[PDB]
Amino acid sequence: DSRKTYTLTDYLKNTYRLKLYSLRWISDHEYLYKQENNILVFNAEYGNSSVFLENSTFDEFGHSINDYSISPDGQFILLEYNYVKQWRHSYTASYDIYDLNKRQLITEERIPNNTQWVTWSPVGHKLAYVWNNDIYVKIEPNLPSYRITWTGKEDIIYNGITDWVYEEEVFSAYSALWWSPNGTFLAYAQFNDTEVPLIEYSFYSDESLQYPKTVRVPYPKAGAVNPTVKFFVVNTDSLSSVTNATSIQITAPASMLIGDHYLCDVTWATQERISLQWLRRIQNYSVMDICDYDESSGRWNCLVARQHIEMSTTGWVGRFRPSEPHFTLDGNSFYKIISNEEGYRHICYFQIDKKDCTFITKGTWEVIGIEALTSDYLYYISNEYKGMPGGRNLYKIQLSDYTKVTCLSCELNPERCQYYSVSFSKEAKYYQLRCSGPGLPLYTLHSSVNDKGLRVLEDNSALDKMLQNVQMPSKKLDFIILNETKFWYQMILPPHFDKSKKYPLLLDVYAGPCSQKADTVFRLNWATYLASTENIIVASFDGRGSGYQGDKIMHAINRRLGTFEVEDQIEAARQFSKMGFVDNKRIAIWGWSYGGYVTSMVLGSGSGVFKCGIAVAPVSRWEYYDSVYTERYMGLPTPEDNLDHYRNSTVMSRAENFKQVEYLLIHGTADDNVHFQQSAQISKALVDVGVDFQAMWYTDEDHGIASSTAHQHIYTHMSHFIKQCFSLP
Amino acid sequence: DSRKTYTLTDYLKNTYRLKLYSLRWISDHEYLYKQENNILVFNAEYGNSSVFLENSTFDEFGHSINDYSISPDGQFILLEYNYVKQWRHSYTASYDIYDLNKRQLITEERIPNNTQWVTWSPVGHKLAYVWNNDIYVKIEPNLPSYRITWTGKEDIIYNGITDWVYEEEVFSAYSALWWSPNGTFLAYAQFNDTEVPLIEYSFYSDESLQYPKTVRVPYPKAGAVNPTVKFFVVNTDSLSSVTNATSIQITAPASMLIGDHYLCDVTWATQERISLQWLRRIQNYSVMDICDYDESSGRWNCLVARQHIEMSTTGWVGRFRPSEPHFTLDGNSFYKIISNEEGYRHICYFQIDKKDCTFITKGTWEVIGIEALTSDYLYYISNEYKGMPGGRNLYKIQLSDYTKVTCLSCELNPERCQYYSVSFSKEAKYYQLRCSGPGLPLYTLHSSVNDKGLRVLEDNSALDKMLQNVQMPSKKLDFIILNETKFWYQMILPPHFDKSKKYPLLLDVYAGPCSQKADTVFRLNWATYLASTENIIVASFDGRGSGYQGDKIMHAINRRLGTFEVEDQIEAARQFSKMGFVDNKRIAIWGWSYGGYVTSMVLGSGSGVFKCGIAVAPVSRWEYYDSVYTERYMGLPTPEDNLDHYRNSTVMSRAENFKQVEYLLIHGTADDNVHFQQSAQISKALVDVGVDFQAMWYTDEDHGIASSTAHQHIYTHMSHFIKQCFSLP
Numbered sequence A, B: 001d002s003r004k005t006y007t008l009t010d011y012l013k014n015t016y017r018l019k020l021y022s023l024r025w026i027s028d029h030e031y032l033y034k035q036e037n038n039i040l041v042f043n044a045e046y047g048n049s050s051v052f053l054e055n056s057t058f059d060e061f062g063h064s065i066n067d068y069s070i071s072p073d074g075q076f077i078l079l080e081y082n083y084v085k086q087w088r089h090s091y092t093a094s095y096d097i098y099d100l101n102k103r104q105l106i107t108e109e110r111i112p113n114n115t116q117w118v119t120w121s122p123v124g125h126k127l128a129y130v131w132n133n134d135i136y137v138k139i140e141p142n143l144p145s146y147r148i149t150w151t152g153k154e155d156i157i158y159n160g161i162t163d164w165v166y167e168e169e170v171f172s173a174y175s176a177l178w179w180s181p182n183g184t185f186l187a188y189a190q191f192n193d194t195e196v197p198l199i200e201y202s203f204y205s206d207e208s209l210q211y212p213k214t215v216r217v218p219y220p221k222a223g224a225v226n227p228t229v230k231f232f233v234v235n236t237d238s239l240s241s242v243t244n245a246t247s248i249q250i251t252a253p254a255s256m257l258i259g260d261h262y263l264c265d266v267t268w269a270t271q272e273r274i275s276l277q278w279l280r281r282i283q284n285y286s287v288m289d290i291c292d293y294d295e296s297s298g299r300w301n302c303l304v305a306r307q308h309i310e311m312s313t314t315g316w317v318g319r320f321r322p323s324e325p326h327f328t329l330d331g332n333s334f335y336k337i338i339s340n341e342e343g344y345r346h347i348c349y350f351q352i353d354k355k356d357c358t359f360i361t362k363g364t365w366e367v368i369g370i371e372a373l374t375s376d377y378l379y380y381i382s383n384e385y386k387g388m389p390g391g392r393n394l395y396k397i398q399l400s401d402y403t404k405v406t407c408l409s410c411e412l413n414p415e416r417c418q419y420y421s422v423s424f425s426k427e428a429k430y431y432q433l434r435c436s437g438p439g440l441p442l443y444t445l446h447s448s449v450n451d452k453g454l455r456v457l458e459d460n461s462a463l464d465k466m467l468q469n470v471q472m473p474s475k476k477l478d479f480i481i482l483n484e485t486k487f488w489y490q491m492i493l494p495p496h497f498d499k500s501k502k503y504p505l506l507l508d509v510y511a512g513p514c515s516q517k518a519d520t521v522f523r524l525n526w527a528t529y530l531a532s533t534e535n536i537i538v539a540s541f542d543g544r545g546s547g548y549q550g551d552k553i554m555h556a557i558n559r560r561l562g563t564f565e566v567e568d569q570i571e572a573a574r575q576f577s578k579m580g581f582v583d584n585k586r587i588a589i590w591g592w593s594y595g596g597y598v599t600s601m602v603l604g605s606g607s608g609v610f611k612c613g614i615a616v617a618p619v620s621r622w623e624y625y626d627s628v629y630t631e632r633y634m635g636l637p638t639p640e641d642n643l644d645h646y647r648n649s650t651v652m653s654r655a656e657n658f659k660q661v662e663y664l665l666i667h668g669t670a671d672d673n674v675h676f677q678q679s680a681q682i683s684k685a686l687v688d689v690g691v692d693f694q695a696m697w698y699t700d701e702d703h704g705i706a707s708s709t710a711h712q713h714i715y716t717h718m719s720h721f722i723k724q725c726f727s728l729p
């Protein structure tokens, strides 16, 4: 073989690009799609298109447009520019509204600069936005806004947006507002961070800045004072008729008010029914309220007969949080993924005023998500097919007969496609399937009326062609047996892999709770280069604490982070040695964030198994990490709760054992998530016991170390280190 | 040769220790010396001693005594403990006073904890101290203190202590107090930092600290708002318990008040006469006032006819600041080192009443310091002998005939001793000579009347005998010629140096203005190990900008930092590389602080001479560094002054050129002097152009990276780097 390999530059420079097919449904029949910077509108049924917006219409704009969004009634388009990243989901931007009917920009009563969030109402063209931490509503794009809150205060009161920890760990979003289905009501959360301590770090900025700035962010570490939260609902239809519309508060249940708690889910059921889930700071107890608008008092009432309790005896509640309900049209019943009696997550069906639900799925596998619900059918994704926890398929269950379950995706192309996600049109008339492995991504459009394939949207044949000329690595997905339990693993194997030979191995680790690093997804990444060009086997292993396989496995690390998930990685490497194709003198380990923690814990174990390793942005001590995430698994760091284990599971206390390995420690200085502090303490502890190691900081890079130049620099730096670790004398 | 070499462990663990002999003169006849933790008093003429304080008198004190300070009359001893370092000179401590007559500790009116500075009067046993930024005076150790100032405010108003930049760059001390010769008056400065911006950086502290703290320090970077200063004198003989002490202000001259200025020298002339020097922010103009106490006014008058102006047309004034005056017994005249018309630093004799001074020394060499003055002789150290700029000897000059100059140290032991410093008794009746190279240090006692060598105090006999069993490197001091000028260099040469072998070479650079790295001093440092064990030649070179050779050389870099002194290093290495015993494929460079800057500029020069280098806490951009030092050499970074060269002289601009070298960049995160910022911006510029390099941060280390564990760690890491750089294919 004399084909070129997949090299480091190929990865860093994106030589071989995955084609996507990102569409946005605007109705039950139509979707939008970007073709050569034009925006086309497509008829789902026939596949014909038209130009919705010519690529030329905003040359005279004066600003580089970042993104757009169309009002649901098709009458307006929201143009977003001056985009400035904040945290994982948050950012600020400017906005203009373009009137698609007058084919003109709106120049009156403009959305202000430095707007934090904006969203159309779900019907029509109402807008709600957050600016300087307060909520505003526009009934009409050209008309003046109604202010909803006056309490907004930078770093202190957040109305309709999350603070740092709620954004990262609770809502996976910045926005904390929720329009009712037809846009009458605007629900929102308000966060009070008054007593939450600040993380403080330097940001150096462009070379031209003389004095570095100090970034200060309300951020509760483990056991510290959390933000408090309140929930309100305003009737936006009353705005133009009243001076100052009343925000009606819906208070948390008594069982929550006794202590620290979180708002963890908001979901509208009908025009006049909203559901809330609350979670105790000790995250093994949650309560759902279901609240009705009382038309004669203007108030919101949550009948205790409608309150649902979700708890856990073995761990926390939910995968990362209690799951969302999906309500039937009339809002009198709902479906919800919950852990069954055997510890497997399955769909349960509830009447809103009956406490016991009925399971509609069951088995030793898990429902990943409920994707759509019609009067006749519920569609969901599971890992049922072939008992593969790392696969994903779309299924359709008949609501009038639960024994009738069709797999909609399983056999479409079983060799090429074992990992699916889906996108339904507005009333589930059509669906896009997105296959993402083990072969090249494949996007297809389907019609729900008959589940017939309409057309291939994108098959990546261009890439496939290019990839023929390349000595691509292969992926093996399998399992090994420990104490009568299956534990899955994957291996990125060099091309022409020969079992008779001994190979350097890199163990690519994450291993946080409910993580899954062994799966059927096709990836073009650093591992691809290492296996293809450097002939390294890159392995990953889902041990105790890993997800999608039941609570027996997932909750094994409950209150005990830094134990089983760490030792199971070490054991994995041992088992790979036994397999006979691994050079046991050349075993390396690496990971990012939770993977950095695990890597460091493994390198400090004294096991003798690993020659070297790389921790990027590691956690080093659970008390440095945020409350919501950490406490979920570890409880509170107090003598009466779990302090002993918090203190026993630090990287620093293993500093002496790093004498036996080669270590590379890397961290962005402006990491708002895993604070530079965490590596600063590892390095100090290593210096303190006389251990030599390698280090790299990335000035002004955050958790992602994702700026174009830093991304290339870090993977270059890590490649040299691995190659040095591995090469033969 | 079966002998051990001088290893890295020997340097790090201090296996071979230089013996010292640190005495304190208490009179014209006697000195104190700490021996076996006992304090002894020595008669200088005979050599006999008595015990002044037994090593056990404080056995039940309950604290470790950091240090001691005996009152000038011998009646009291100030005990220092709870020492907590601040910057280069500043610290706080607790103090107790022990009465030597009563043989007991004083327990009433104790000096407060967290005392910032304390000092005895020059005669007797009065005390002045600073606490919470205010000045206090005790007439007697057991009596209540009088409060002198009431304006002290942390980080804002400093009475009798310096702020950050005055401590580091002006006085090389924390104290800003000056007793009159007999203790009647206490002079002091007051610093006001209200509008000085703060440098801010993280401090991580011990592992147990959950949130890092932010350290905030008033620190003016180049061009920023400086502290303002006032000067005051208070009579300590007329203090009352009833009324608030009165301080008399001496205002700066009009020529200073017109703009930003500094107080740069305070020197008492008589019991009732004080001199002060002031320096313009543009540091090429200074003025001395000489101020007489007026008994009927109770005021201090500085006659214009007694002003002395000192300026420079080619650079700044003085080496690092205008030199100190040395007044005669009547205070009517004084001696002062100033740059002569040839640009060489020599002793000028001034009358307080007359504008023209008279040079009493001349020649192409320089006076280092005036050391002692009698009515018959002035004693000084110069580098006159053998025309060697890097040697130092003690001379006396006859005041009645300037042609009569006698060298007192030159011929004592020319082979071992070419570098001296001196300590004189109270009326210069006796002097101690401290030889520090080229051989092992040698301390001798002498009497002034006929310059008799009385006795050897310490000859390092023991060390000599240990060193005979080690393969020690030698030192070559020599010169090269550039455009007709001698420039000196030194080489630390491996044992058994062979002019026919080719050795790798490390350029140890500092090269700041007025620096000297080529000298006759004996040193046991990192270079010693590199030469003795690794057989690396370690060279240093004094090019343009270097000190003690006249202003033509020293002022060459005026307004032009990062030019000629960087060029001259490259040129020296170029010349070394053409010598027969230097391997031109293995030339490295390293330096700390100003040396880190120069090392970085050299590596980024594109010269191709250097294979690798190490920068420790480098400056990278002159606008990041402090006003007093930077502006001395650079002027102001404004478009109408010197901004273009501030911007042309950054390390960052040369990032591209690092592509062809190996670079290790190291910095302490708690460096208050050269901020971590400076390295953060270097790394970021290197990342931006795709250059790989090596880095190490030291968590919570300041500029010295001097904690015992960090110090071992940095040198271990640098040793690995140099060894790898010099390892042969």
Ligand SMILES: *[C@@H]1O[C@H](CO)[C@@H](O[C@@H]2O[C@H](CO)[C@@H](O)[C@H](O)[C@H]2NC(C)=O)[C@H](O)[C@H]1NC(C)=O
Residues within 6 Å of the ligand: A150, A151, A244
């Ligand atoms: C709209 O109503 C709210 C609620 O009463 C007003 O906000 C209050 O204003 C007073 C006085 O300014 C404060 O003391 C209260 O704490 C505020 N309450 C809340 C819940 O924020 C608001 O000012 C009204 N807006 C207008 C324009 O009248």
Ligand SMILES: *[C@@H]1O[C@H](CO)[C@@H](O[C@@H]2O[C@H](CO)[C@@H](O)[C@H](O)[C@H]2NC(C)=O)[C@H](O)[C@H]1NC(C)=O
Residues within 6 Å of the ligand: A182, A183, A184, A235, A237, A271, A272
């Ligand atoms: C959206 O839903 C809301 C809430 O049910 C509707 O508002 C109610 O409409 C009925 C008319 O059938 C009135 O009797 C009530 O007074 C309304 N209640 C409130 C709180 O406004 C609203 O009409 C619906 N909007 C649309 C466009 O259909």
Ligand SMILES: *[C@@H]1O[C@H](CO)[C@@H](O[C@@H]2O[C@H](CO)[C@@H](O)[C@H](O)[C@H]2NC(C)=O)[C@H](O)[C@H]1NC(C)=O
Residues within 6 Å of the ligand: A282, A284, A311, A312, A313, A314, A635, A640, A641
């Ligand atoms: C939620 O988690 C906590 C901690 O695991 C549980 O509290 C423990 O409960 C048992 C049984 O009452 C006690 O013996 C322990 O002392 C408790 N530990 C504490 C308070 O730290 C709590 O019971 C859990 N809730 C559920 C439903 O399992």
Ligand SMILES: *[C@@H]1O[C@H](CO)[C@@H](O[C@@H]2O[C@H](CO)[C@@H](O)[C@H](O)[C@H]2NC(C)=O)[C@H](O)[C@H]1NC(C)=O
Residues within 6 Å of the ligand: B151, B157, B192, B193, B194, B195
């Ligand atoms: C220290 O300096 C500041 C100015 O840098 C002085 O504050 C000024 O004082 C005058 C008179 O009191 C006011 O009119 C100004 O408005 C003040 N300026 C600022 C910026 O605050 C302060 O008085 C000085 N302190 C001492 C003790 O001398």
Ligand SMILES: *[C@@H]1O[C@H](CO)[C@@H](O[C@@H]2O[C@H](CO)[C@@H](O)[C@H](O)[C@H]2NC(C)=O)[C@H](O)[C@H]1NC(C)=O
Residues within 6 Å of the ligand: B182, B183, B184, B235, B237, B271, B272
């Ligand atoms: C220290 O010097 C001061 C200043 O000259 C002496 O104080 C003066 O002494 C004279 C002569 O006795 C008095 O008439 C003056 O009134 C004093 N001046 C002041 C300003 O107080 C003082 O005597 C000297 N101290 C010692 C211990 O000798």
Ligand SMILES: *[C@@H]1O[C@H](CO)[C@@H](O[C@@H]2O[C@H](CO)[C@@H](O)[C@H](O)[C@H]2NC(C)=O)[C@H](O)[C@H]1NC(C)=O
Residues within 6 Å of the ligand: B282, B284, B285, B311, B312, B313, B314, B635, B640, B641, B642
């Ligand atoms: C102190 O230094 C400054 C800066 O070099 C000198 O000011 C310069 O003087 C010349 C001639 O008078 C002017 O043409 C320049 O424009 C000035 N430069 C600046 C930046 O102002 C000043 O003359 C020096 N003082 C002495 C005594 O030499």
Ligand SMILES: *[C@@H]1O[C@H](CO[C@H]2O[C@@H](C)[C@@H](O)[C@@H](O)[C@@H]2O)[C@@H](O)[C@H](O)[C@H]1NC(C)=O
Residues within 6 Å of the ligand: A041, A042, A043, A046, A048, A049, A050
């Ligand atoms: C797409 O075409 C629509 C025309 O309807 C006919 O399309 C023919 C191709 C054929 O299949 C007939 O059966 C259909 O009745 C038209 O109404 C839509 O406006 C077009 N949509 C877009 C986005 O261009």
Ligand SMILES: *[C@@H]1O[C@H](CO[C@H]2O[C@@H](C)[C@@H](O)[C@@H](O)[C@@H]2O)[C@@H](O)[C@H](O)[C@H]1NC(C)=O
Residues within 6 Å of the ligand: B041, B042, B043, B046, B048, B049, B050
């Ligand atoms: C130091 O010596 C003094 C003792 O007298 C000396 O006289 C010399 C002339 C010579 O003959 C010596 O042998 C004698 O010892 C005495 O006054 C000092 O107090 C002594 N001790 C000290 C200063 O600690």
Ligand SMILES: *C(=N)[C@@H]1CCCN1C(=O)CN[C@@]12C[C@@H]3C[C@@H](C[C@@](O)(C3)C1)C2
Residues within 6 Å of the ligand: A088, A168, A169, A172, A320, A512, A592, A593, A594, A595, A619, A629, A673, A674
């Ligand atoms: C690194 N992985 C850090 C340290 C341990 C927790 N981790 C987080 O960033 C936690 N936040 C999330 C939780 C889940 C899974 C990951 C993506 C996220 O969006 C959802 C946020 C990490």
Ligand SMILES: *C(=N)[C@@H]1CCCN1C(=O)CN[C@@]12C[C@@H]3C[C@@H](C[C@@](O)(C3)C1)C2
Residues within 6 Å of the ligand: B168, B169, B172, B320, B512, B592, B593, B594, B595, B619, B625, B629, B673, B674
């Ligand atoms: C490193 N050398 C830094 C950056 C450039 C100047 N430098 C300083 O620390 C300046 N301060 C002094 C100035 C002189 C020489 C050195 C010792 C000192 O006490 C007197 C303080 C450095």
Ligand SMILES: *[C@@H]1O[C@H](CO)[C@@H](O)[C@H](O)[C@H]1NC(C)=O
Residues within 6 Å of the ligand: A036, A037, A038, A055, A056
């Ligand atoms: C605009 O659209 C046309 C296709 O109709 C295409 O040729 C052109 O490249 C597009 N321009 C940009 C800037 O995307």
Ligand SMILES: *[C@@H]1O[C@H](CO)[C@@H](O)[C@H](O)[C@H]1NC(C)=O
Residues within 6 Å of the ligand: A094, A110, A111, A112, A113
């Ligand atoms: C936003 O910023 C610019 C000034 O930088 C201004 O001209 C523009 O009008 C602003 N937009 C709005 C909506 O205020």
Ligand SMILES: *[C@@H]1O[C@H](CO)[C@@H](O)[C@H](O)[C@H]1NC(C)=O
Residues within 6 Å of the ligand: A151, A157, A192, A193, A194, A195
């Ligand atoms: C936020 O909480 C603090 C107490 O922590 C309180 O004083 C303040 O009023 C609150 N602000 C609100 C709810 O707007």
Ligand SMILES: *[C@@H]1O[C@H](CO)[C@@H](O)[C@H](O)[C@H]1NC(C)=O
Residues within 6 Å of the ligand: B094, B110, B111, B112, B113
């Ligand atoms: C210094 O600190 C100790 C211990 O807290 C205290 O008892 C003592 O009184 C302090 N000294 C003075 C002079 O205040």
Ligand SMILES: *[C@@H]1O[C@H](CO)[C@@H](O)[C@H](O)[C@H]1NC(C)=O
Residues within 6 Å of the ligand: B150, B242, B243, B244
């Ligand atoms: C001295 O001055 C200070 C501050 O101005 C004042 O508070 C104090 O009362 C004064 N004391 C006397 C005795 O005048």
